[PDB]
From a paper:
Our subsequent investigation of one gene cluster (Rv3093c-Rv3095) associated with ethionamide resistance that contained a putative monooxygenase/repressor pair with some resemblance to ethA/ethR, indicates that Rv3094c is likely a flavin-dependent monooxygenase that sulfoxygenates ethionamide, and Rv3095 is its transcriptional regulator. Ethionamide is a second-line anti-tubercular drug used to treat patients infected with multi-drug-resistant or extensively drug-resistant isolates, and is a pro-drug that requires metabolic activation before it can exert its cytotoxic effects. To investigate the mechanism of ethionamide sulfoxygenation by Rv3094c, we solved protein crystal structures of apo-Rv3094c, and Rv3094c in complex with FMN (Rv3094c-FMN) and ethionamide (Rv3094c-FMN-ETH), at resolutions of 1.91 Å, 2.00 Å, and 1.64 Å, respectively. All three crystals contained one tetramer per asymmetric unit, tetramers being formed by two homodimers, the C-terminal domain primarily mediating interactions between the two monomers.
The overall structure of the apo-Rv3094c monomer consists of an N-terminal domain (residues 7–95) composed of five α-helices, a middle domain (residues 96–214) composed of four α-helices and an eight-stranded β-barrel fold, and a C-terminal domain (residues 216–376), with a seven-helix bundle structure. The lack of a Rossmann fold suggests that Rv3049c can utilize either FAD or FMN, explaining the presence of FMN rather than FAD in the crystal structure obtained. A structure-based comparison between Rv3094c, one-component monooxygenases, two-component monooxygenases, and Baeyer-Villiger monooxygenases showed that Rv3094c clusters with two-component monooxygenases. Superposition of apo-Rv3094c structural homologs not only reveals strong structural conservation of overall topology, but confirms that the location of the FMN binding site, lying in the pocket between the β-sheet and the C-terminal domain, and stabilization of the flavin ring by hydrogen bonds are also conserved. Substrate binding, however, induces movements in the side chains of some amino acids in the apoenzyme and binary complex structures.
Residue numbers in the entry: 6 to 248, 255 to 376
Write the structure that this text describes.
Amino acid sequence: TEIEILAEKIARWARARSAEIERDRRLPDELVTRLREAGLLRATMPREVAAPELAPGRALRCAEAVARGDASAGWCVSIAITSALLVAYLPARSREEMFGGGRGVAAGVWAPRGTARSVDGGVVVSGRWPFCSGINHADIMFAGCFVDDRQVPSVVALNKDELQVLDTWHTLGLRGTGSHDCVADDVFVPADRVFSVFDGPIVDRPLYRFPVFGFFALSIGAAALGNARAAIDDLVELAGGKKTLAERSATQAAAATAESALGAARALFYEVIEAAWQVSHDAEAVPVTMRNRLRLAATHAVRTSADVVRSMYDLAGGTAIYDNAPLQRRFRDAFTATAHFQVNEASRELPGRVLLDQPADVSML
């Protein structure tokens, strides 16, 4: 069957529904079903819950291919396969309750915005989390919080049932991601469903040795990269018959600059994923040096993708300002992705610390 091939087929479906995806701020049910049937929304869950436990380079290649069809759809894949890693941090019994037998699609917001009081058998958590991508089609939301007075934050596995989904996702781009805010109000969480990411996974296999904050950052890079490739596709198709635009010296120098910039960002992206994947098979934890390279490459990929899409948009000139032009949505989507905290310009400083052998807190690298 081959999941990469299914990803490319689903990308073409996402492209054909892209007007409706943006209009409704959500993926159509038929597209969620395709994604679910191909295993893409649970690809990185462990084999014990009937899931592919797909290697991370393959999973990220799948996210990128769907993003080339539609950036919001690919982003949904990115967040679902990142969230799905946390299924490996649940004790066997709550894992089987929420995800057993092919069940459960996860969303996740890592920021520790909740406050959790400890009680008999569990905790009581309240808080509000912005930018919950995929909450429209997920069952479970992993959310970060502080438990009692601890200074190391925790994660609680909430059911969408007990949450209030507010209609707040009115944004420049990535509209289909429906990344609304979610509110918990005195929700009880059994102990079964509270953990620290910093204690490591219950399932101790290579996919879960792969750095989990690195993977999060890389999945945004994958969606950005797939969006940018689609923008170059759009410009090349326009330039042949616009009068021509293609026959003109600045256009080809710019097309050449963009193609080599994107190719170079893409090549570094997969080179560092493959190198970290190899050492994820070794006894010791993946070193800080390797984790540093994953974050460098993720940020570079998102920022280069934005530069590339901006250049294509600019070359299209008067065509791309109109709502019916494909480059306009790529532009809007690319400059929503650059705002994410895992891959913004500020995320260059800590990985620069490491490079310069300076004292650094690398707990979330």
